[PDB]
Amino acid sequence: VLVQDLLHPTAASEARKHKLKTLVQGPRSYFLDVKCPGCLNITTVFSHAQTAVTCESCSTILCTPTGGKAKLSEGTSFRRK
Amino acid sequence: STELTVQSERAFQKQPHIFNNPKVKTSKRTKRWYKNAGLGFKTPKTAIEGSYIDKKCPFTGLVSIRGKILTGTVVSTKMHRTIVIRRAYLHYIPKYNRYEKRHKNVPVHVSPAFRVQVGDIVTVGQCRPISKTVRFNVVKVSAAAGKANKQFAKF
Amino acid sequence: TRSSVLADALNAINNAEKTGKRQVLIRPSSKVIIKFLQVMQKHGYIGEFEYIDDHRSGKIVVQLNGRLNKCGVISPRFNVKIGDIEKWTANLLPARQFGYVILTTSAGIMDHEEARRKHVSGKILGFVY
Amino acid sequence: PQAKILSQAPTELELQVAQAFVELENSSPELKAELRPLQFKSIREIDVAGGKKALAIFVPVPSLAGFHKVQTKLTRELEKKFQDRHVIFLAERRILPKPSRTSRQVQKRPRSRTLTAVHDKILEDLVFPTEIVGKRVRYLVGGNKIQKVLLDSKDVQQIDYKLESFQAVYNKLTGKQIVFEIPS
Amino acid sequence: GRMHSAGKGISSSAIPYSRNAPAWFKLSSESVIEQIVKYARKGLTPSQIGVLLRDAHGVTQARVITGNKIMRILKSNGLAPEIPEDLYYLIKKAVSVRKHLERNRKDKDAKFRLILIESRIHRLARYYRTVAVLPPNWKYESATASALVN
Amino acid sequence: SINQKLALVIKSGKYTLGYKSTVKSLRQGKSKLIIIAANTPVLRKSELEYYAMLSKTKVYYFQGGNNELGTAVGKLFRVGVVSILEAGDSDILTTLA
């Protein structure tokens, strides 16, 4: 381009980059507030949880570890943050 | 060394020309001689009120510290009242405009006032020829903690 | 392994300049790089550079002006005397009227002209012209 | 309980603030364990370029955790009583100089006592209700060095009218030319 | 990268720029500490404590929520083990390779792998002996190393 | 996994090593789980099974001889049978193994 703005890249340009290779490195992972069908208590889980997070009522699975993001247990109700 | 065989060989070990009178008794029964070494070297307290003799001690013996003051690292304490220090330095070669690490071993007489361990940094003062190879005495040992505290049994 | 972050900064500026770019992103933005760039900016070989302060080491975006010919580093940082500075500038600089050999000195990071006029000498970092 | 909440004898510029703390204690459910034990060191008055003044008050920093809990409330009615002022809740963090070569061996300086970390904590406490999401340092071609502080877009309505007073007091304390911006 | 391989992959964790986090944590910095100690009383290593805190709880990082890191929390609460967890897992990997090796003596790939694992142990143990995390004269013996893992 | 449960019993709970202290603990009724090695003699393990059946304590069979029990409990000698007096922070009693 021979002239570009490194200090103010496009949001579309930054969103497709690697998490390390942005202008300031940060994660794309987040946290979720999950309600199991068993009870009403809010349990905070991780997106890439990599462990079978459990609740007190439905104490079998609330998610399932995978290669990347955790798979929520097909009946849970979650909201971000 | 107040104890552990002050007199341990065929000769009676005493400081020369220092007289302990057996007529005028005192409350110490030991008349010890010592001197200030000079050059801001504090005479150690074990040298002041010990019972060793060490005619080559720079505080209680008959040797004066004069000449050069060097600093080295103890690499051997296996001799009796004598240590070898290792002085590491850089030598410059003008052709390549660079340096080389070089070491020189210095044998140093050490008084029993000091406790000297391998890995310690000592400063040494030049004296008259003490032995075939020894021309220096330990005048001060530099060790505060020695990195030997976090190295033990945990709970 | 990154051994000289100043060398990686000066090679990135030189590669962006030789391709004709007007801006260059530098990692990981040491303060030796900041002081070297401040001498380059003082003498006009670069322009504005802004330091992106992330919480690890930072980044520097330098604005070029098509004006630098070669910014290089001398590695290792040789100890230069006050009489060896004329030899280093005769060896490294294209002419006697322009170009500066940058010296890290205990009076500060400075080029050979203000180091001679301060009568201070140290080790040599690099050159700019 | 007037001068006991100041811990210094002078002066009346803080004594009127110290009494204005007590008459703002008519909230007995929340007076206990929230506002009663809090206490401040000193008061500085800074003039902004817009003709206004700003209070820069110092709290002794064992207690920013409990003091920040009331700061976002207490700023509102303190500003209503003291219009033509902008109140900023700083902490008194000691700055220790770095040792020279010929200096005596004082205890090792913690990184919190360095000059750069105190200035960073001055900035963070200066913009309290927002969070700093980035920092840039422009190095101007004439030798100028301008700090840029990026603020989180959430909860900016409380602070957006005080950015000039924030940069005037920070230039007064740290002597550093700074600006602010909010990404969108 | 990959001191004992040709891999150049990066695949790391990018922690946030926010040194105060995460503005929805309603749990106290004290209560997460007894949750750390509760998990450490259950025998969990500091890396497994941080994983389990990040997953079941909202703990982004213990250093950003509390004042210190997890292994420092265990040291101040007296639950630091005799061996660091990375050296411990390296030693038990070399023990398990050797236990495989007496059953399969002609596993020359496993012998090459054991040499690489043991050389990683000697480099890590030399660093620990320099920084006095480990006592001096602490030697990995490859025969008494099963006593270090139990 | 099982060795981790044994190691957490050793660090945090109470136990006795050996045949004679295990028999004494079974007679006192103080035993919860007895772990018997693989190479232990069958007459010896038959008497340990009888005492555990006579005192209602669980029996676990270690997959490995007395050399492996000694290493699993952290010792440098062969342990033919280890009795667990009181579990510590481990769930070796709640889990069947």
Ligand SMILES: [Mg+2]
């Ligand atoms: Mg790489």
Ligand SMILES: [Mg+2]
């Ligand atoms: Mg290699």
